C-alpha cells in the first residue's frame, strides 16, 4: 500500500516518508504535495491542477506558493543540483528519474 | 466533434443535479447549506471557511467539525448506493 | 483477544492496564481513547474521526476536550518528554514506538 | 463445581455462601447477582446488561436498583471501605482483589 519511487518511500497509514532510510519530518501541506507527486510519478502535473487538488479548491492567492513548497521539498530530499523532482517551464513539476 | 454536446450526458447531469438536490434536502438545513456554499452549488464560487463563518455566525473550527460530520454521515450506505450509478 | 503495543499492555476483558510493571487506573472516556489508539496502533487518527468513534455523535462541544484527554493520558503513560504517543498538527493523533 | 473467589465461597446446590468461611444470609435477588459475577469472574459488568440479564426485560423504569444492590453487598460482605467488588463509574463493577 506504500507509494515508492527510487529513494522515496511514503507510507500514508503510518504517515512517514523515507529518503534512503532515516526519519524526516515535513509540514502537512508539503506532505500531501509529496503524496500527490509520488502517486503520479513520471507524469507532469500542471500548476492549476496542483493548486486545485493539493491546495483547497477556492485558493484565491498567487501561484508561487507552490514553487516555494517545491523548493522546500527539493532542499529536503534532493540534495544535489541534479534532481529527481524535475520542473518543466510553463507545464509544472514532476517526479521522474533522470536519464 | 469533440466539443459537441452528446445529448445523453446532459440528461444524466440534470438527473444527477435533481438527485443531489433531493439527497441534500434529506439532511438537516444547516448542514445542507454548509455543504452547498462550501462546494459552490447555488452559485459558481465555492465559499471559504471564513466566508461561511461570517455568513452563519459560527466559529470556523466548529464549521470544519460540522462539515466533516456531514460528510461522514453523507457517506452513508443508502446515499452512496443511490449515487453510485451516476459515475 | 488481548491488546499489546511494545511496553503497553491492555486487557479489555476486565479493563486493566500495565505499563512497565505497574497497573494504573484511568477514566472511562480516556480508557476508550487508549483502546481506540491501541486497536488502531500504527495508523493516524483524525480528531473528527476520533470523536465520532469514542464520544457521542451529537457532541456539540468544542475540540479542546480531546487535547485535555490526551494530556491526561500523557501524564500517566509516558514520563519522558520524547513521546511514545505522538501528535501530528492538523492530521490528528497516533501511537508509535519512539525512534 | 462449587464456586469461589479469593476466600468468598458459594455452593450452587445448597445455596450457602461463606465470607472466608463466615456465615451470611443473602436475599435471592442479589444472590443470583453474586452467583453471576462469580461465574464470569475476570470481566467488568455494567448496568445495561445487569438489568438486561439478571432482571426482566419488562423493567423499563428506575435504574438505581443495581446501585442499591451493590450497596447492600458492600455493607454486608466487606467491612473495610476498600471493597473487593470495585466500581468503575459508567461501566459498572468488577470483582478483584487489592494489588
From Swiss-Prot, chain B:
Q: Which residues bind DNA?
A: 49-68
Q: What induces it?
A: Constitutively expressed under all conditions tested except for 3-fold reduction in stationary phase, standing culture and upon growth in H(2)O. 2-fold induced by starvation. Half-life of over 40 minutes.
Cystine connections: none
State its location(s).
Answer: Cytoplasm
- Region (Sigma-70 factor domain-4) residue ranges read 23-76
* Family label: Belongs to the sigma-70 factor family. RpoD/SigA subfamily.
Tell what the record comments on domains: The sigma-70 factor domain-2 mediates sequence-specific interaction with the -10 element in promoter DNA, and plays an important role in melting the double-stranded DNA and the formation of the transcription bubble. The sigma-70 factor domain-2 mediates interaction with the RNA polymerase subunits RpoB and RpoC.
- What does the function comment of this entry state? Sigma factors are initiation factors that promote the attachment of RNA polymerase to specific initiation sites and are then released. This sigma factor is the primary sigma factor during exponential growth.
Tell me the subunit arrangement.
Interacts transiently with the RNA polymerase catalytic core formed by RpoA, RpoB, RpoC and RpoZ (2 alpha, 1 beta, 1 beta' and 1 omega subunit) to form the RNA polymerase holoenzyme that can initiate transcription. Interacts with WhiB3 and probably with RbpA probably via its sigma-2 region.
Miscellaneous note, as given in the UniProt record, is:
Was identified as a high-confidence drug target.
What protein name is recorded for this chain?
Answer: RNA polymerase sigma factor SigA
Q: Which organism is it from?
A: Mycobacterium tuberculosis (strain ATCC 25618 / H37Rv)
Section covered of the full-length record = 441 to 527 of 528
Amino acid at each position: 500500500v506504500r507509494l515508492t519511487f527510487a529513494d522515496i518511500e511514503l507510507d500514508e497509514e503510518t504517515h512517514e516518508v523515507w529518503k534512503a532510510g532515516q526519519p524526516v519530518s515535513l509540514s502537512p501541506t508539503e506532505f500531501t504535495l509529496l503524496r500527490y507527486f509520488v502517486i503520479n510519478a513520471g507524469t507532469v502535473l500542471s500548476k492549476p491542477k496542483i493548486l486545485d487538488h493539493v491546495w483547497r479548491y477556492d485558493f484565491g492567492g498567487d501561484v508561487n506558493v507552490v514553487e516555494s513548497y517545491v523548493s522546500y521539498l527539493r532542499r529536503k530530499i534532493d540534495t544535489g543540483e541534479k534532481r529527481l523532482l524535475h520542473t518543466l517551464r510553463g507545464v509544472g513539476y514532476v517526479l521522474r528519474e533522470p536519464r | 466533434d469533440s466539443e459537441a454536446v452528446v445529448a445523453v450526458d446532459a440528461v444524466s447531469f440534470t438527473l444527477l443535479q435533481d438527485q443531489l438536490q433531493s439527497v441534500l434536502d434529506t439532511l438537516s438545513e444547516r448542514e445542507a447549506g454548509v455543504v452547498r456554499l462550501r462546494f459552490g452549488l447555488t452559485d459558481g464560487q465555492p465559499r471559504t471557511l471564513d466566508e461561511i463563518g461570517q455568513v452563519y455566525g459560527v466559529t470556523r473550527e466548529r464549521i470544519r467539525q460540522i462539515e466533516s460530520k456531514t460528510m461522514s454521515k453523507l457517506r452513508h450506505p443508502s446515499r452512496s448506493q443511490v449515487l453510485r450509478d451516476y459515475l
